[PDB]
Amino acid sequence: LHKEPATLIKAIDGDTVKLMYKGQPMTFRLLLVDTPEFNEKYGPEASAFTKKMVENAKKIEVEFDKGQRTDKYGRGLAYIYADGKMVNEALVQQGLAKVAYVYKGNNTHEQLLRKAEAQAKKEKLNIWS
Numbered sequence: 001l002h003k004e005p006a007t008l009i010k011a012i013d014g015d016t017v018k019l020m021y022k023g024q025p026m027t028f029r030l031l032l033v034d035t036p037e038f039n040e041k042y043g044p045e046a047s048a049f050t051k052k053m054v055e056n057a058k059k060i061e062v063e064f065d066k067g068q069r070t071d072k073y074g075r076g077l078a079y080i081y082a083d084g085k086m087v088n089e090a091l092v093q094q095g096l097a098k099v100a101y102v103y104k105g106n107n108t109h110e111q112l113l114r115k116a117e118a119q120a121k122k123e124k125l126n127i128w129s
């Protein structure tokens with residue numbers, strides 16, 4: 001897998017963000033994770049967490065996996081990095097997302113994310129509290 005550049009257009013919620021990629025606006029859904037909706041418990045905290053992380057980054061990157069790059073709603077499916085740090089992983093470490101939506105062929109960073117989730121659960125952070 002390889003990282004590619006992108007620029008923030010707008011934060012949307014915990015696990016979706018609008019980015020400019022190859023010069024085009026696109027909504028990105030984070031691979032392998034699930035944040036609560038904004039109207040659900042820990043949803044506002046998830047949206048805040050992602051928003052802060054993407055807005056403060058000097059460098060946003062996109063990393064596609066080996067399978068489909070777009071979901072059925074036209075959202076790109078990627079791992080997103082903020083100054084070298086994976087937002088998908090950071091959310092899970094904080095107990096602000098669960099590992100979810102693990103489909104075959106787009107699951108390269110599954111076991112990395114599971115390990116973060118196990119550490120979040122041990123700490124009884126946020127979603128695990």
Ligand SMILES: Cc1cn([C@H]2C[C@H](OP(=O)(O)O)[C@@H](COP(=O)(O)O)O2)c(=O)[nH]c1=O
Binds near residue numbers: 072
């Ligand atoms: C994360 C992800 C979600 N999706 C689809 C499955 C879910 O379908 P349904 O909408 O039919 O429930 C939906 C969950 O996304 P959200 O958690 O943003 O709603 O997005 C994919 O198809 N591939 C993925 O990798």
Ligand SMILES: [Ca+2]
Binds near residue numbers: 015034035036037
């Ligand atoms: Ca969600």
